[PDB]
Amino acid sequence: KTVQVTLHAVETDVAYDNKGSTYRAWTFDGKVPGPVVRVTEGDTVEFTLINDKNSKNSHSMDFHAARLDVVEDFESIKPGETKKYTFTADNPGVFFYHCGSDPMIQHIARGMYGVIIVDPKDANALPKADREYVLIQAEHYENPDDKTAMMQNKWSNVVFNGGVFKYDPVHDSEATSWLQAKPGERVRIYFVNAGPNELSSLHPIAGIWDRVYPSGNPKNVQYALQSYLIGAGDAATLDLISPVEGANAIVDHSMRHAHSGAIAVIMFTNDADPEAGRGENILIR
Amino acid sequence: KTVQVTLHAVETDVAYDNKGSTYRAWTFDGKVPGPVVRVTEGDTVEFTLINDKNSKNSHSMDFHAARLDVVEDFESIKPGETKKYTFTADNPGVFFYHCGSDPMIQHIARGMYGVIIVDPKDANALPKADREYVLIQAEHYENPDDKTAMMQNKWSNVVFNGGVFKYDPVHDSEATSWLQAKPGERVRIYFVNAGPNELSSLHPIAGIWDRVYPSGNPKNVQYALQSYLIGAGDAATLDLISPVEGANAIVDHSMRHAHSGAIAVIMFTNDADPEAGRGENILIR
Amino acid sequence: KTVQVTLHAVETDVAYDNKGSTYRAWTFDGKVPGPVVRVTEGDTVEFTLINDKNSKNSHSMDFHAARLDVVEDFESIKPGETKKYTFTADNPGVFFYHCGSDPMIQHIARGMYGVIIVDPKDANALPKADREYVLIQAEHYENPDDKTAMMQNKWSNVVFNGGVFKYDPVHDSEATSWLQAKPGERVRIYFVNAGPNELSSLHPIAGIWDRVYPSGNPKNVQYALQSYLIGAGDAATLDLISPVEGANAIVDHSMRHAHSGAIAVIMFTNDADPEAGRGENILIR
Ligand SMILES: [Cl-]
Ligand SMILES: [Cl-]
Ligand SMILES: [Cu+2]
Ligand SMILES: [Cu+2]
Ligand SMILES: [Cu+2]
Ligand SMILES: [Cu+2]
Numbered sequence: 028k029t030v031q032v033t034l035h036a037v038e039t040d041v042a043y044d045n046k047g048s049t050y051r052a053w054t055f056d057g058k059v060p061g062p063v064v065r066v067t068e069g070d071t072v073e074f075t076l077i078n079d080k081n082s083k084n085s086h087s088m089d090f091h092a093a094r095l096d097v098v099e100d101f102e103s104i105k106p107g108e109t110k111k112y113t114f115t116a117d118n119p120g121v122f123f124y125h126c127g128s129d130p131m132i133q134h135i136a137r138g139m140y141g142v143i144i145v146d147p148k149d150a151n152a153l154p155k156a157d158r159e160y161v162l163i164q165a166e167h168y169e170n171p172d173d174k175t176a177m178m179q180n181k182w183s184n185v186v187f188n189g190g191v192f193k194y195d196p197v198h199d200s201e202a203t204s205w206l207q208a209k210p211g212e213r214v215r216i217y218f219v220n221a222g223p224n225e226l227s228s229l230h231p232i233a234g235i236w237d238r239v240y241p242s243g244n245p246k247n248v249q250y251a252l253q254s255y256l257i258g259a260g261d262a263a264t265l266d267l268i269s270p271v272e273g274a275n276a277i278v279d280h281s282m283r284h285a286h287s288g289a290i291a292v293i294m295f296t297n298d299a300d301p302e303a304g305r306g307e308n309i310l311i312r
Numbered sequence: 313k314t315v316q317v318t319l320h321a322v323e324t325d326v327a328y329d330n331k332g333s334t335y336r337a338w339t340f341d342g343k344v345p346g347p348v349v350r351v352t353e354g355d356t357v358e359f360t361l362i363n364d365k366n367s368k369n370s371h372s373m374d375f376h377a378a379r380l381d382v383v384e385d386f387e388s389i390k391p392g393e394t395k396k397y398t399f400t401a402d403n404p405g406v407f408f409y410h411c412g413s414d415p416m417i418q419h420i421a422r423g424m425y426g427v428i429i430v431d432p433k434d435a436n437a438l439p440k441a442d443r444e445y446v447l448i449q450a451e452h453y454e455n456p457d458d459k460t461a462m463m464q465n466k467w468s469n470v471v472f473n474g475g476v477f478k479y480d481p482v483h484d485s486e487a488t489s490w491l492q493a494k495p496g497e498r499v500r501i502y503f504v505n506a507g508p509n510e511l512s513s514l515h516p517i518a519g520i521w522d523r524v525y526p527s528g529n530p531k532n533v534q535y536a537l538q539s540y541l542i543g544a545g546d547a548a549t550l551d552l553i554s555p556v557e558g559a560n561a562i563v564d565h566s567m568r569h570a571h572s573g574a575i576a577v578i579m580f581t582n583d584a585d586p587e588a589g590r591g592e593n594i595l596i597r
Numbered sequence: 598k599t600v601q602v603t604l605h606a607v608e609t610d611v612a613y614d615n616k617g618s619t620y621r622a623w624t625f626d627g628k629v630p631g632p633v634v635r636v637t638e639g640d641t642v643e644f645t646l647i648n649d650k651n652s653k654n655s656h657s658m659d660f661h662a663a664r665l666d667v668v669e670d671f672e673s674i675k676p677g678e679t680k681k682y683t684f685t686a687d688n689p690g691v692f693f694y695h696c697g698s699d700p701m702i703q704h705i706a707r708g709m710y711g712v713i714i715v716d717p718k719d720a721n722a723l724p725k726a727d728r729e730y731v732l733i734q735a736e737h738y739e740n741p742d743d744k745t746a747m748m749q750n751k752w753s754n755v756v757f758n759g760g761v762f763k764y765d766p767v768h769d770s771e772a773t774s775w776l777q778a779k780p781g782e783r784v785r786i787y788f789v790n791a792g793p794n795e796l797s798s799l800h801p802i803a804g805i806w807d808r809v810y811p812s813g814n815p816k817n818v819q820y821a822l823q824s825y826l827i828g829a830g831d832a833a834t835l836d837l838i839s840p841v842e843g844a845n846a847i848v849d850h851s852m853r854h855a856h857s858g859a860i861a862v863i864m865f866t867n868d869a870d871p872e873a874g875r876g877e878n879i880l881i882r
């Protein structure tokens with residue numbers, strides 16, 4: 028099918044921790060991460076980027092799901108301008124999207140990133156998931172204007188979905204969100220490492236990845252992995268099943284990353300919310 | 313079968329180089345790395361942790377081979393307490409174990425880490441190894457109390473099995489240990505990257521990895537790899553066969569890691585000790 | 598077949614950026630990277646290294662394609678000396694080669710690295726490439742004598758084939774080289790990450806890796822990867838096909854790397870130079 032996707036480049040204050048601290052983010056649609064885009068393998072995507080008139084900077088859009096021309100298609104547009112391009116989603120899986128404007132390190136760091144999920148045309152290529160969650164890792168830099176700190180890799184926190192310990196009520200009692208499932212359910216994690224700089228060594232504490240798919244592609248399946256390396260600008264699909272009620276903690280096992288905010292709790296309970304990890308709830312905001 | 317495994321949390325001084333430099337380590341059973349645990353896929357493990365009465369810190373145990381509840385099973389216990397849990401080893405391969413107590417970066421860095429090997433139920437899934445050796449990479453930090461330096465990734469050395477150049481009598485005149493095999497033999501390396509922070513890019517100088525199994529699982533086999541990336545908190549099984557007498561040097565090929573201590577020599581001789589890499593000589597102490 | 602490969606260890610000034618900045622490089626055959634070595638799986642390589650009489654340092658040769666003895670074969674030779682050894686290329690793919698002399702971090706950093714390509718004996722094991730390009734990533738250090746800065750990972754730039762933005766006319770007006778292909782053609786990238794220290798997260802902006810081969814080996818094929826991690830001292834083969842005229846930009850997606858020089862443009866045009874990416878043009882000088 029043909030789908031229309033329109034996003035705004037929006038520069039606005041957003042919260043990055045559980046105590047309400049904010050920073051001047053650069054975003055798609057006013058939130059970090061950007062909106063989940065979801066299509067089927069083979070779909071035509073008619074994409075529109077609107078750079079809001081009140082932006083102070085030029086912005087662009089790079090989809091890792093797209094095969095295009097970097098110079099024309101991923102070009103920067105000024106505040107008040109609108110850009111269109113069309114691409115087919117040729118390969119199934121999970122893909123990073125982000126602003127490609129100058130300097131990319133900063134546009135990514137300030138929050139212009141998201142995921143596009145490309146469902147396999149063959150609905151039987153992946154085992155059926157009972158829950159789906161998006162987790163996007165990024166570094167948070169204390170001063171969004173300081174490009175030198177970014178070049179020097181001097182981050183303040185490493186986070187999932189834009190918030191320090193957003194999903195960790197164990198380590199931060201002010202956290203108000205977490206992942207849910209029932210024991211025995213297949214939980215599918217769509218993971219993107221936005222960077223801009225760091226790698227992630229992703230591990231479910233007290234669990235194991237039942238299966239891992241590099242770039243989300245069924246052909247690349249790996250089994251029973253305790254951990255999986257996701258480089259900067261890479262993405263993978265990782266399945267998790269708990270045999271028991273309780274919790275696992277999804278961590279970036281480079282411990283200084285984990286301690287700085289990269290931990291997400293999943294609670295396994297028999298009375299898990301039927302809406303959790305389904306529908307429009309896959310990226311928990 | 314059901315296997316009983318009991319470990320003590322023991323805070324004690326241990327050596328970290330070949331000239332007898334010591335640090336105040338936190339350990340399982342008074343040694344770094346902890347005791348090798350070895351079971352068969354499908355086995356029931358009845359585990360007991362005893363936190364010694366003279367410890368000054370709470371400790372815990374996290375097995376990457378276990379599928380449990382992080383909150384109750386991996387909970388920290390006080391000096392003088394004893395904790396029990398049972399798990400089945402559902403997946404074959406090679407798995408990191410470590411203390412999970414706060415802050416994990418420090419409990420790992422201070423020496424609370426080891427390996428559990430889960431032999432495949434199908435003893436013919438893996439090609440028969442003639443020798444087996446455990447190598448666990450970790451960073452050593454000069455001051456075990458300086459958590460800031462750990463968070464800044466400012467390690468003093470990167471080491472195998474707790475010692476600077478432990479197995480490198482070429483670069484260290486004071487080194488007395490090395491790995492042994494005969495030409496033509498299949499040498500199986502059980503490798504864990506304990507971290508806490510760093511990645512390892514593992515290469516046998518003058519050799520090639522015949523096979524590499526991510527998380528040690530036979531289903532994930534890779535062939536003829538010059539190098540293999542093991543992220544912090546990950547493990548893999550790597551096979552090596554020399555066609556000639558002489559040496560290879562197993563290194564973390566991120567050269568600043570290798571030069572800081574992460575080199576292990578394997579000697580291939582026709583008269584290799586029939587006891588080396590067999591029984592409980594697999595982790596050379 | 599048996600092939601003779603002779604290289605010289607040459608210490609000489611070479612350019613490392615598009616404005617003609619030079620440094621005192623240590624090299625094979627007076628250029629950085631060294632000459633491309635290409636043989637077929639099963640071939641016998643009769644190798645000779647001659648250390649030039651005017652060299653000030655001892656040098657050696659380490660082929661990741663060789664299974665030998667680190668002690669005797671990879672030994673260092675003084676200025677005016679010659680080392681000879683023979684090896685069979687037992688495994689197909691793509692392999693790092695470099696000086697292995699004390700300290701390896703500096704010998705690599707100063708330019709003593711290259712690639713050996715080992716074509717599969719089975720001509721059909723890889724899909725047929727229409728273009729081939731060699732890309733070797735390395736860190737450039739400001740002062741080639743400052744070993745402490747290397748040990749501390751304080752690099753100035755991360756580069757492909759010895760040059761800051763060597764193939765990026767888009768981000769550097771003084772860049773005079775880039776990769777060329779036609780739309781629809783299979784472009785094969787032989788990628789080596791020489792390090793000495795850093796990881797690469799390789800991504801074609803506006804494209805996708807059709808296939809990736811860890812160590813170049815047909816047995817390890819992965820499909821449709823957006824990005825691929827190449828550790829220090831590792832190598833891989835990566836195929837790229839653009840369906841359209843335009844450009845892709847091959848980048849190390851750890852952005853502080855890319856912005857420091859690690860970006861190579863490939864131009865897809867209907868009248869690409871028939872000589873580009875063929876014969877001995879594959880490593881563009
Ligand atoms: Cl032991
Ligand atoms: Cl045991
Ligand atoms: Cu932007
Ligand atoms: Cu990208
Ligand atoms: Cu502990
Ligand atoms: Cu762990």
Ligand SMILES: [Cu+2]
Binds near residue numbers: 656657696
């Ligand atoms: Cu040299």
Ligand SMILES: [Cu+2]
Binds near residue numbers: 565693695830
């Ligand atoms: Cu090497």
